[PDB]
Amino acid sequence: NTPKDQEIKKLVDQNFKPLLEKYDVPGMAVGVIQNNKKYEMYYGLQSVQDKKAVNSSTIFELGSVSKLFTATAGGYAKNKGKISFDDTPGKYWKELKNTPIDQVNLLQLATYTSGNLALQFPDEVKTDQQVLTFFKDWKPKNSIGEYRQYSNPSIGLFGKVVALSMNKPFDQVLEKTIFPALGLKHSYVNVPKTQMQNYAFGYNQENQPIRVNRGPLDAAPAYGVKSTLPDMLSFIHANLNPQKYPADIQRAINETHQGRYQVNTMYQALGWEEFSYPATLQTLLDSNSEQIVMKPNKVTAISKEPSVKMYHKTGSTNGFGTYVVFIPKENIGLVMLTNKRIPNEERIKAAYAVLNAIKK
Numbered sequence: 596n597t598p599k600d601q602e603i604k605k606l607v608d609q610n611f612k613p614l615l616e617k618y619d620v621p622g623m624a625v626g627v628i629q630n631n632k633k634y635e636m637y638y639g640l641q642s643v644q645d646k647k648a649v650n651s652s653t654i655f656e657l658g659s660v661s662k663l664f665t666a667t668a669g670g671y672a673k674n675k676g677k678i679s680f681d682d683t684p685g686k687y688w689k690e691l692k693n694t695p696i697d698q699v700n701l702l703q704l705a706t707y708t709s710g711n712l713a714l715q716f717p718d719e720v721k722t723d724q725q726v727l728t729f730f731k732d733w734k735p736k737n738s739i740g741e742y743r744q745y746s747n748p749s750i751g752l753f754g755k756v757v758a759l760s761m762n763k764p765f766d767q768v769l770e771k772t773i774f775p776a777l778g779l780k781h782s783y784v785n786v787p788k789t790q791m792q793n794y795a796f797g798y799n800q801e802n803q804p805i806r807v808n809r810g811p812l813d814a815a816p817a818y819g820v821k822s823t824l825p826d827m828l829s830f831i832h833a834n835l836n837p838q839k840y841p842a843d844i845q846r847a848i849n850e851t852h853q854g855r856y857q858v859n860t861m862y863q864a865l866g867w868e869e870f871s872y873p874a875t876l877q878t879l880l881d882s883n884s885e886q887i888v889m890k891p892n893k894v895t896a897i898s899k900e901p902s903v904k905m906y907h908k909t910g911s912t913n914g915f916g917t918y919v920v921f922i923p924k925e926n927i928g929l930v931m932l933t934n935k936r937i938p939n940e941e942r943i944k945a946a947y948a949v950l951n952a953i954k955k
């Protein structure tokens with residue numbers, strides 16, 4: 596026989612470890628949770644110049660996986676009566692009243708269906724007034740609610756409206772409310788100086804050490820969260836077992852599991868991307884295709900409400916890669932964290948092979 600932990604370690608060795616040499620990745624953390632049992636696998640260095648090994652205290656930048664905490668915070672404020680998904684941003688940011696952006700509702704902002712919001716804020720938009728001027732000068736292009744265009748400013752305005760409804764800055768909404776409620780003790784929007792020695796360097800395509808740039812404050816809901824592998828395994832555990840939490844946090848997590856519309860085989864939930872399970876590999880790869888990620892796509896109402904579902908989300912900054920995935924019916928999830936970007940298809944393919952080969 597071979598113990599289950601050695602079986603998972605071998606599968607991660609055969610599928611994820613080759614990616615380090617293939618893409619010259621300094622460090623990697625891979626974690627699997629199955630039936631409430633966590634398995635952690637660390638590779639390489641969190642800092643090349645310091646020869647510091649990746650370990651359970653290593654803090655990675657989550658990139659777009661931050662959007663799952665913004666969605667959770669949004670579901671929390673919705674179930675606590677602070678917002679309604681039918682509300683518009685001008686209701687909470689009063690300066691946006693009687694402006695074109697005030698016709699899009701909060702759910703449409705969180706699911707990227709405003710009809711005229713690109714992937715990124717403009718480069719010059721950085722200060723608080725510049726973000727307000729951007730949304731004030733916003734004008735519609737496509738019919739509101741009909742086309743999904745993956746957008747950081749879109750969910751950034753949603754996260755900003757969520758924070759205003761709780762009378763707290765967004766970084767406090769996560770670090771004072773959502774992170775403590777989920778048991779995450781090493782997840783940050785702003786890493787304190789006492790934890791900087793655990794903050795890994797990220798590495799660009801020239802393997803130069805880099806870290807994320809503090810852009811507009813309203814970009815943190817889009818890609819500004821940093822966490823460790825044990826905290827992300829706890830976060831996957833929360834999505835698998837929402838009953839571990841009081842009602843409003845439990846309903847917040849379930850809110851992020853409810854698909855809102857379809858784009859081909861992809862269900863757009865709150866933050867999470869949802870799929871019928873079992874999913875083909877090409878279904879999961881399609882979700883990160885240039886056509887889905889970079890272009891506007893007409894949305895369709897959900898036809899098949901999936902009874903058996905699975906969810907995932909890719910995330911990247913300039914020097915980090917992330918991938919999270921879980922399947923509720925199999926009580927299993929996976930997290931991948933790297934301090935260098937690797938193609939999204941390689942993260943999806945490697946996790947697909949690991950999860951399907953793990954004996955249930």
Ligand SMILES: *[B]([O])([O])[C]([C]N1[C]=C(C([O])=O)N=N1)[N]C(=O)[C]SC1=NN=C([N])S1
Pocket residue numbers: 658659660747806807808810818909910911912913914936939
């Ligand atoms: B998110 O990860 O999806 C989002 C979009 N994205 C994906 C990728 C990729 O596949 O490599 N790159 N961006 N991530 C971001 O928007 C990161 S924005 C940053 N601004 N400054 C930095 N140093 S990272």
